[PDB]
From a paper:
The covalent modification of target proteins with ubiquitin or ubiquitin-like modifiers is initiated by E1 activating enzymes, which typically transfer a single modifier onto cognate conjugating enzymes. UBA6 is an unusual E1 since it activates two highly distinct modifiers, ubiquitin and FAT10. In the presence of Mg-ATP, E1 catalyzes the acyl-adenylation of ubiquitin, initially forming a ubiquitin-AMP adduct. Subsequently, the E1 catalytic cysteine attacks the ubiquitin-AMP intermediate to form a thioester bond between the cysteine and the C-terminal glycine of ubiquitin, resulting in the formation of a covalent E1~ubiquitin adduct.
We initially determined the crystal structure of UBA6 in complex with ATP from an orthorhombic crystal form (space group P21221) at a resolution of 3.3 Å. Subsequently, crystals belonging to space group C2 became available, which diffracted anisotropically to 2.7/3.8 Å and, due to the higher resolution, will be described here. The cores of the two UBA6 molecules present in the asymmetric unit exhibit almost identical conformations with a root mean square deviation (rmsd) of 0.26 Å. However, the accessory components, the FCCH and SCCH domains as well as the UFD, display enhanced variability around this conserved core. The interactions between ATP and protein are completely conserved in the UBA6-ATP complex, thus illustrating the common framework for ATP-binding and hydrolysis in the E1 enzyme family. Due to the limited resolution of the UBA6-ATP complex the metal coordination cannot be fully resolved, however, a Mg2+-ion was modeled at the Mg(1) site, while a Ca2+-ion appears to be present in the Mg(2) site. In particular, the FCCH domain in UBA6 exhibits a movement of 7.5 Å away from the AAD-IAD core and hence away from where the ubiquitin molecule binds in the AAD domain as well as a 29° rotation. This change consequently introduces a broader cleft between the FCCH domain and the core of UBA6. At the same time, interactions between the FCCH and SCCH are formed. In the B-chain there are extensive contacts involving a hydrophobic core formed by F217, L232 and I287 of the FCCH domain and the aliphatic part of S737 as well as P738 of the SCCH domain and two ion pairs involving E249 (FCCH) and R740 (SCCH) as well as R248 (FCCH) and E876 (SCCH).
Numbering used by the authors: 35 to 801, 818 to 1031, 1035 to 1051
The structure:
């Protein structure tokens, strides 16, 4: 458990799961049976996660039908009749090199001995008969430690997932949240001793919980101790004898210790008779047990007749209903059978829906990780995902639509029908972003057949970014030899490997207004659907605005660690993304960042800002100044003449104080350290001593503020040497100074610093000339030949969180922690500071696969033009686990009294002529739509307000003069507000047309 986890590959996953959990995965061997789409999806997610060893088992040989459900199989494999597991093994191995993947072709029978399974910690079973599953479940739960058991299957549009980790299973962390921290006001010297908490915040503890202690002064003995506590009252608890310990003074933090929690699982047989579920939708509470009855009936039918129901066959469907009614009588609550679920299960049972399998596989993969690590709360036995909304809106369809045509889409055709398959083939989709969700979506397109008709199919994928190692953890199309290559291009070539017929147009562009020429209104109207795999709200709002303008549907999705969400936006049926409450995340006060920090977050922000200011902004301004004003002699002449040059002062100082060699950079780092962590504290203490109190009679340096303490530089201390080394390197690269690791040695730095250290004890600040000083500096520089063109140029650094060599993160961490030490806030690790400073989002493959599969199901509904009832928005948290499906937000229709009602999608149109005035436009809007404009705006430009200066003049002005198109386009779009209400009300966009010629 001392292995070094590769942060370069698993950086985001480490934020989701934690190093300890990953270390447990590094020891885990998992056995997976059945290599259909579901099994391959699960194996893919587990291998990417880093499970030490995955055994891949299948008895069946490749067929054409498999080519539709398997994204690594080939026609060559089908012709040679290779084993499904053996054919795909190298491709799966390529996903994670650290993992060891092995294939088994051993037949699995009742006669077969199950002893071999003892090597594995977890067993996942797909495409296996229920009787043998029960036998393996008994074997696995009877072992000690018990082998954890998962059973997963997808039949048509219905799915079944089961988890049994043993009669007793230990959940080490339930939510994944950091443990709560309590602050100690006092601790008594008594038997038992009593710990007391700050009166502002109660501890909210339990009389049995265990707490660890740190940062106590006086009672130094308690630090590092774990004590089981007894709650005396809110704000007070009893730990144990403290009389022998030294008397308490101040401080102290108590952190709760997570105690392993026991969860109990019943066997597969017991659960089949009496199943357990977490019911999410109380609109349909009985749905899961009805699906359970139908799926169990399907298993009984498979046993009796050794085959699944045929599409259309009434004898088979009637027999399945009989078996379901019998099962319902055996079930404890005598649940009434659902005929629709049984009918559709018989109808689609021979089909396989790949998007649903992607979703189920993501959920099942997370369950495997839960079994081997204990990191999250496990599925409490059953999950029954369904795609019933896809088949319900079709109506009563022709059984011939769902009959095979001898092509790879037979599986999909058995679930959704040939007509919708063809609609998917004849599709124009715009995929904005090609990240984790983008890669999963491209796989789901290739298996669904999207854009495969040559004549009228196209998938447009656009991304500006290049591939990185950290991406490889969750972007399975990309591989290590693709690093530093465009994402869109690489994904397109891989997607073509999955499906040769697919048509993909790949771009390296960013979807912003600058590229609106490439992605114009014509382009959007051509596109049947737009799907956003973005990471920022600004891009989502821009694409949402574009979709609203061109009345096209948008599918939006996102992943945060184990959390995920899907949003479906359909024109004229649902509300759009821009309709949200759009709250800004945070707005730290300048005072709290630059003078009075209270949190490690504040200091990390200050360190990031200092990195950008020192090594990006100032170099950029320096280069721009000298290129704009050419020679230094010309700049001096301009300054003496009296011309105004922006930023002359700072640039001249930088040129005067420019480092020329490594020792100068080391000196600069030392002086900057002194200014940041010594002088700032003393100057703040001078303007504001601890004694001053007058905000409210007698108040200052209260609980929010922290008084600073000066820091004394010691090269022996670790943070000090780290700051010096990384700061000097960064300054040196900015000023193009050559240096070597020999220079970075602490001994060499000590010879530079201690021998030649000028540290004057500066007095407090508070305790024409500047222009002349700059003139003197510039004069001396040009005189000494120091202002050569080479010295008037600097190098600009770009913050890169993912390069350990560059030293950006190490400088930020040292600066943040040194500032924290000054204000006494507790430090943060390098990786925690990296996450905060780089705004890294925790990400894992299971969640992205789950979210993407769900979005693909919604895309199927959108291509069929389904009703509002069918579309569903989703929120998933795989930690709980919970999946919440809600009806999509209904389009809001706003009507002003005696006005035409309007929605986000509607745009009102008014026509213009050569002789037209603002008053004419106002009257025209009132005539056509029944409501009178009381405000007119173009862009940010204000055209009309009734309560404004000179409103009457503007009312009669001609429209062409009032607008300033420049484009001299056929129309200009104006925003309109109406008075009725004591505030103005927004109205639909009004489009004015300059040319009519009628
Ligand atoms: N306006 C835009 N147009 C096109 N692609 C965009 C736009 N904005 C962001 N993207 C892309 O959206 C994708 C989002 O996916 P993802 O979360 O994996 O990003 P990432 O950079 O790989 O994240 P991380 O930094 O955690 O590795 C990225 O490929 C990013 O390049
Ligand atoms: Ca339904
Ligand atoms: Ca990137
Ligand atoms: Cl500075
Ligand atoms: Mg991103």
């Amino acid at each position: 458990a001392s292995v070094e986890i590769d942060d370069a590959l698993y950086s985001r996953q480490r934020y989701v799961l934690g190093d300890t959990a990953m270390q447990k995965m590094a020891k885990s061997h998992v056995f997976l049976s059945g290599m259909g789409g579901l099994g391959l999806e699960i194996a893919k997610n587990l291998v990417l996660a880093g499970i030490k060893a995955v055994t891949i088992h299948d008895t069946e040989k490749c067929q054409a039908w498999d080519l539709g459900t398997n994204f690594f199989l080939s026609e060559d494999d089908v012709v040679n009749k290779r084993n499904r597991a053996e054919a795909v093994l190298k491709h799966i191995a390529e996903l994670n090199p650290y993992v060891h993947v092995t294939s088994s072709s051993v037949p699995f029978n009742e006669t077969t001995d199950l002893s071999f399974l003892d090597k594995y910690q977890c067993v996942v079973l797909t495409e296996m008969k229920l009787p043998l599953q029960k036998k393996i479940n008994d074997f696995c739960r009877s072992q000690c430690p018990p082998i954890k058991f998962i059973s997963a299957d997808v039949h048509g549009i219905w799915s079944r997932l089961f988890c049994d980790f043993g009669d007793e299973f230990e959940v080490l962390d339930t939510t994944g949240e950091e443990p709560k921290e309590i602050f100690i006001s006092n601790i008594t010297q008594a038997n038992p001793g009593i710990v007391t908490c700050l009166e502002n915040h109660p501890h909210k503890l339990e009389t049995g919980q265990f707490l660890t202690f740190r940062e106590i002064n006086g009672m130094t003995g308690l630090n590092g101790s774990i004590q089981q506590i007894t709650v005396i009252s809110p704000f007070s608890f009893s730990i144990g004898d403290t009389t022998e310990l030294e008397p308490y003074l101040h401080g102290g933090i108590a952190v709760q210790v997570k105690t392993p929690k026991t969860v109990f699982f019943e066997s597969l047989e017991r659960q089949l008779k009496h199943p357990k579920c977490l019911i999410v939708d109380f609109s349909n509470p009985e749905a899961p047990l009805e699906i359970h009855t139908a799926m169990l009936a399907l298993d009984q039918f498979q046993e009796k007749y050794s085959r699944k129901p045929n599409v259309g066959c009434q004898q088979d469907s009637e027999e399945l209903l009989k078996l379901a009614t019998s099962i319902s009588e055996t079930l404890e609550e005598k649940p009434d059978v659902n005929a629709d679920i049984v009918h559709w299960l018989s109808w689609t049972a021979q089909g396989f829906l790949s998007p649903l399998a992607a979703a189920v596989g993501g959920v099942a993969s997370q369950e495997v990780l839960k079994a081997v690590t204990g990191k999250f709360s496990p599925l409490c036995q059953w999950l029954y995902l369904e795609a019933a909304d896809i088949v319900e809106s079709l109506g009563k369809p022709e059984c011939e639509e769902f009959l095979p045509r001898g092509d790879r889409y037979d599986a999909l055709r058995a679930c959704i029908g040939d007509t919708l398959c063809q609609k998917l083939q004849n599709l124009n989709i715009f995929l904005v972003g090609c990240g984790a969700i983008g890669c999963e979506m491209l796989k789901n397109f290739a298996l669904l057949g999207v854009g495969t008709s040559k004549e009228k199919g196209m998938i447009t994928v656009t991304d500006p970014d290049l591939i990185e190692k950290s991406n490889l953890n969750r972007q399975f199309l990309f591989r290590p030899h693709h690093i530093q290559k465009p994402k869109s291009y690489t994904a397109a070539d891989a997607t073509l490997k999955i499906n040769s017929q697919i048509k993909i147009d790949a771009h390296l562009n960013k979807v912003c207004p600058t590229t609106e020429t490439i992605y114009n209104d014509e382009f959007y109207t051509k596109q049947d659907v737009i799907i956003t795999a973005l990471d920022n709200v600004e891009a989502r709002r821009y694409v949402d605005s574009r979709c609203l303008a061109n009345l096209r549907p948008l599918l939006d999705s996102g992943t945060m660690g184990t959390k995920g969400h899907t949003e479906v936006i359909v024109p004229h049926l649902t509300e759009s993304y821009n309709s949200h409450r759009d709250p800004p995340e945070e707005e730290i006060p300048f005072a709290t960042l630059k003078s009075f920090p209270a949190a490690i977050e504040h200091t990390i922000q200050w360190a990031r800002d200092k990195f950008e200011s020192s090594f990006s902004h100032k170099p950029s301004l320096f280069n721009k100044f000298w290129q704009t004003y050419s020679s230094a002699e010309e700049v001096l002449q301009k300054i003496q003449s009296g011309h105004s040059l922006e930023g002359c002062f700072q640039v001249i100082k930088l040129l005067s104080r420019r480092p020329r060699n490594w020792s100068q950079c080391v000196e600069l780092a030392r002086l900057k350290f002194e200014k940041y962590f010594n002088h700032k504290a003393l100057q703040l203490l001078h303007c504001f001593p601890l004694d001053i109190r007058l905000k409210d009679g007698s108040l200052f340096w209260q609980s929010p503020k922290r008084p600073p303490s000066p820091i004394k530089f010691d090269l022996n201390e670790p943070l000090h040497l780290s700051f010096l080394q990384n700061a000097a390197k960064l300054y040196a690269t900015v000023y193009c100074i050559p240096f070597a690791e020999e220079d970075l040695s602490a001994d060499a730095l000590l010879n530079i610093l201690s021998e030649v250290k000028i540290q004057e004890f500066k007095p407090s600040n508070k305790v024409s000339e500047d222009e002349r000083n700059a003139i003197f500096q510039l004069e001396k520089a040009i005189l000494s030949n120091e202002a050569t063109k080479s010295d008037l140029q600097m190098a600009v650094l770009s913050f890169e969180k993912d390069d350990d060599h560059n030293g950006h993160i190490d400088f930020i961490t040292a600066a943040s922690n040194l500032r924290a030490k000054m204000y006494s806030i507790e430090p943060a690790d390098r990786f925690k500071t990296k996450r905060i400073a780089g705004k890294i989002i925790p990400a894992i493959a299971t969640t992205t696969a789950t979210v993407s599969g769900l979005v693909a199901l919604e895309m199927i509904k959108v291509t069929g033009g389904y009703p509002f009832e069918a579309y569903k928005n989703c929120f998933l948290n795989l930690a709980i686990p919970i999946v919440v499906f809600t009806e999509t937000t209904e389009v809001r229709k706003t009507k002003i009294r005696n006005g035409i009602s309007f929605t986000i999608w509607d745009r009102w149109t008014v026509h213009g002529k050569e002789d037209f005035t603002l008053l004419d436009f106002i009257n025209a809007v009132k005539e056509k739509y029944g409501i009178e404009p009381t405000m007119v705006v173009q862009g940010v430009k204000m055209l009309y307000v009734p309560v404004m200066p000179g409103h009457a003049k503007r009312l009669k002005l001609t429209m062409h003069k009032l607008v300033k198109p420049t484009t001299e386009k056929k129309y200009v779009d104006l925003t309109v507000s109406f008075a009725p209400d004591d505030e103005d009300l927004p109205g639909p966009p009004v489009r004015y047309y300059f040319s009519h010629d009628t």
